[PDB]
Amino acid sequence: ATRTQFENSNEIGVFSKLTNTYCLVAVGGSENFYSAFEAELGDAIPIVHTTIAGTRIIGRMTAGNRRGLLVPTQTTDQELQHLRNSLPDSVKIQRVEERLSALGNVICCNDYVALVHPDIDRETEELISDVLGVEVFRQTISGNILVGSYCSLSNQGGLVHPQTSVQDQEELSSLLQVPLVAGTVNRGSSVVGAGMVVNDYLAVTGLDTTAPELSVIESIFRLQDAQPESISGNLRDTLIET
């Protein structure tokens, strides 16, 4: 778990997309953000320095996992050609014709399960099941409708926004088959999905994220060797004092 910044903001999920087999970075300014990702990752997975629809908000407009990538209809065919040229053939790219054009705001997926906005069309849900190869579920997140912005999810565990109820956590963790906890990020922000990217071996946050928040997300995402996700029972004194 590391801490970077895009220029001077802590919203890493707004300007980046991270999955198990590729990384997507927004262009602009300098090479510091790309070089932070490349310092942590290396040549192990491709890092693609791209834009979507002329904009820099590429984590909230696209949605993908290990198998596929989904771009909205607002992207252009030159950008989609650039993405196909940069990524290999094991990951397939689909352009979606969907009203809700912020795909990273309206779905929250890993390699097996995807939660979606309830008002998503059936053709779109069939396309998510075809391209990403996952099981789709229409669900809110303690009443919030933007599941990708208010939840952060991987193959190990999940972190949801801090006013989520315990029975909501129980039902959602049964649907998602991962341990699920509530917490904050970037010194007390409820939008935990758009301030932190994560996969099975990495999490990147902002510089203002505190050390209790860092320890809790390292535990629940099982990142370091000393993080068995049940260490909140031994880390409870930090949380009660916090």
């Binding site: 989520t164 991962v178 341990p179 049940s230």
Partner: peptide, 10 residues
């Protein structure tokens, strides 16, 4: 309560 307790998959 919803932060110090971990939800289990079941």
């Amino acid at each position: 309560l919803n932060k110090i307790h971990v939800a289990q998959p079941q």
